[PDB]
Amino acid sequence: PEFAWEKQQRKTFTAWCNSHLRKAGTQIENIDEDFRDGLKLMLLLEVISGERLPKPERGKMRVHKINNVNKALDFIASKGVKLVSIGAEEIVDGNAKMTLGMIWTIILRFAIQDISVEETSAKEGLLLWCQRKTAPYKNVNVQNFHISWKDGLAFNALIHRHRPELIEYDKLRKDDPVTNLNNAFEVAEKYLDIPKMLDAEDIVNTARPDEKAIMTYVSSFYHAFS
């Protein structure tokens, strides 16, 4: 039995991994299984760092997989990440909850941390960028990475600020949140080559939708527009 934030993070983090793994000629399907041998995890880190990790071992025994995951974890540690709750054995053994936490760590370090706006970095910097870009939209008030995005208007406003032809902003009503959210999600996919990472119903019906999932997707817009 699972949580809503858990279904949110699995969809989102899988789609995010795939938005990078596609540049290296592969995809994952099931985040609970497809990183257990460490190969696609090294691949992911090569794509998002623009660097190369130590040669992977493809011998199919457990010890090689543990070795591959430890290289990945060493590469993350080398970029300044203090890994705490996670270890290579439990990843290879398919600790799905731990594997989700490791992917968040990678998203935070490689997609969010280096964002810097007006002497403000990482999550806070990304939020300030959203605030700046959505300033002139009177029916938008970005104050967080959760409820502020629930009605779909902020997503649409972000796109429209950069690419006004993609969004007919005046059609969008505040009390029509699922239409707004899907509209943004569809435009981002078709036109900005940002794959869908969120589910509209999960966003609307959760008092506070998952801010890691929203941060992940929004970080993709920051990089698409930079």
Among 63, 45, 64, 61, CA closest to 53: 45
Resolution in units of Å: 1.5
Within 10 Å of residue 116's Cβ, how many Cβ atoms? 13
Are 107 and 32 part of one and the same domain? yes
Distance CA 14, CA 205 (A): 22
Which of 71, 91, 115 represents a domain boundary (last residue)?
A: 115
How buried is residue 114: exposed, middle or buried, by Cβ count under 10 Å (0-12/13-18/19+)?
exposed
Are 27 and 125 part of one and the same domain? no
Are 46 and 96 part of one and the same domain? yes
Question: Is 177 within 8 Å of 198 (Cβ atoms)?
Answer: no
| Chain centroid, CA 197 distance in Å | 7
Amino acid identity of 14? Answer: T
Are 128 and 160 part of one and the same domain? yes
Buried b (16+ CB within 10 A) or exposed e, 193-211: ebbbbbbbebbeebeebbb
Number of domains in the chain: 2
| Chain centroid, CA 74 distance in Å | 22
Are 152 and 134 part of one and the same domain? yes
Length of the chain: 226
Are 110 and 133 part of one and the same domain? no
Question: Is 214 within 8 Å of 192 (Cβ atoms)?
Answer: no
Cα distance between the two ends of the chain: 40
Are 4 and 109 part of one and the same domain? yes
Are 8 and 110 part of one and the same domain? yes
Are 11 and 96 part of one and the same domain? yes
Distance CA 159, CA 179 (A): 15
Which of 115, 130, 154 represents a domain boundary (last residue)?
A: 115
Question: 117 phi and psi, to 5 degrees?
Answer: -135, 120
Q: How many CA atoms lie within 13 A of 98 on its CB side?
A: 18
Element (H, E) at 51: none
Q: Which residues is 153 bridged to in the sheet?
A: none
Q: How far is CA 18 from CA 50, 133, 155, 171, 194, in A?
A: 16, 27, 21, 32, 11
CATH of residue 194: 1.10.418.10
Are 177 and 104 part of one and the same domain? no
Residue 136 in tokens: 């002139």
Q: Which residue has the tokens 């983090």?
A: 13
Are 140 and 215 part of one and the same domain? yes
Q: Which residues is 120 bridged to in the sheet?
A: 117
Within 10 Å of residue 166's Cβ, how many Cβ atoms? 16
Distance CA 204, CA 185 (A): 14
Buried b (16+ CB within 10 A) or exposed e, 38-77: bbbbbbbbbbbbeeebeebbeeeeeebbbbbbbbbbebbe
Which of 115, 143, 169 represents a domain boundary (last residue)?
A: 115
Are 125 and 179 part of one and the same domain? yes
Question: Is 216 within 8 Å of 13 (Cβ atoms)?
Answer: yes
Question: Is 165 within 8 Å of 190 (Cβ atoms)?
Answer: no
Q: How was this structure determined?
A: X-ray
Query: What domain range is 3 assigned to?
Result: 1-115
